[PDB]
UniProtKB/Swiss-Prot annotation:
Homopentamer. Forms homooligomers. Interacts with MFM1. Belongs to the CorA metal ion transporter (MIT) (TC 1.A.35) family. Present with 768 molecules/cell in log phase SD medium. The chain holds residues 48 to 305 of 470 of the full protein. The keyword Cell membrane does not apply. This is Magnesium transporter MRS2, mitochondrial. GO terms for molecular function: cardiolipin binding; magnesium ion transmembrane transporter activity.
Length: 258
């Protein structure tokens, strides 16, 4: 209601969120653009507790796809974004690794969103698909990294039991487990979305859809990325089980030689 002295802060930039903005043509029209944060939340029908869904924090970010009347709010891995029928906001981060990945997203998103060859797909779904593709590329890279090292160590151990190899395996398994957990959350989120016709219908921002309308094209789109995500869940789960099995087998062998 009224103005009062503010709580002390290290930098007044903390009153703003910053982002990259894409126009209705799909072109980037600003980078590092600042918006007053509480006002921005209110304007986009978000509550103060939703600040983390658009701010520069990168810890404890739960995956989300909020299908609001006039926008889709997305948090997936390094990406926080707000998609409208004729604009996209991609939010800044303090995480260097995330910032590097976001730079590639910007390029690919601008390409796909602004394309004059793709006039069959709604703007908001071009943005959605660009984001899904960028998310899956990040998962692909991590999955290949951690699974390949674990498979190598497992093969090494099957050839000859070795305590140093075993320690290495279980250390590397931590990474695989973290990968499984974050991917599982995304898989379950996409599953929920596919099962909710109200959310699906809401995802059409350019044309108005009823829950009873045909969403085949949007469903095919989401299914594509659901399947890729789900396969990473299945593969990482199976590999983790293989590691647990191997730990148990090695344990028995170690006991038998005591």
């Amino acid at each position: 209601k009224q103005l009062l002295s503010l709580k002390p802060i290290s930098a007044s930039d903390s009153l703003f969120i910053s982002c990259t903005v894409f126009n209705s043509k799909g072109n980037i029209i600003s980078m590092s653009e600042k918006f007053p944060k509480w006002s921005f939340l209110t304007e986009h029908s978000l509550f103060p507790r939703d600040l983390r869904k658009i701010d520069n924090s990168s810890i404890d970010i739960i995956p989300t796809i909020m299908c609001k009347p006039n926008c889709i709010v997305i948090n997936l891995l390094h990406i926080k974004a707000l998609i409208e029928r004729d604009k996209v906001y991609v939010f800044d981060t303090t995480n260097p690794s995330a910032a590097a990945k976001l730079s590639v997203l910007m390029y690919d998103l601008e390409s796909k969103l602004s394309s004059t060859k793709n006039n069959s797909q709604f703007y908001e779904h071009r943005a959605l698909e660009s984001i899904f593709i960028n998310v899956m590329s990040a998962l692909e890279t991590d999955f290949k990294l951690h699974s390949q090292i674990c498979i190598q160590i497992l093969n090494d151990l099957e050839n000859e039991v070795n305590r140093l190899k075993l320690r290495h395996l279980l250390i590397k398994s931590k990474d695989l487990t973290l990968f499984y957990q974050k991917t599982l959350l995304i898989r379950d989120l996409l599953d929920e979305l596919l099962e909710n016709d109200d959310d699906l219908a809401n995802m059409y921002l350019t044309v108005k859809k009823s829950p009873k309308d045909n969403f085949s094209d949007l469903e095919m789109l989401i299914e594509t990325y659901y399947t890729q995500c789900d396969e990473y869940v299945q593969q990482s789960e199976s590999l983790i089980q293989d590691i647990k099995s191997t730990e148990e087998i090695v344990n028995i062998i170690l006991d038998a030689n005591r």
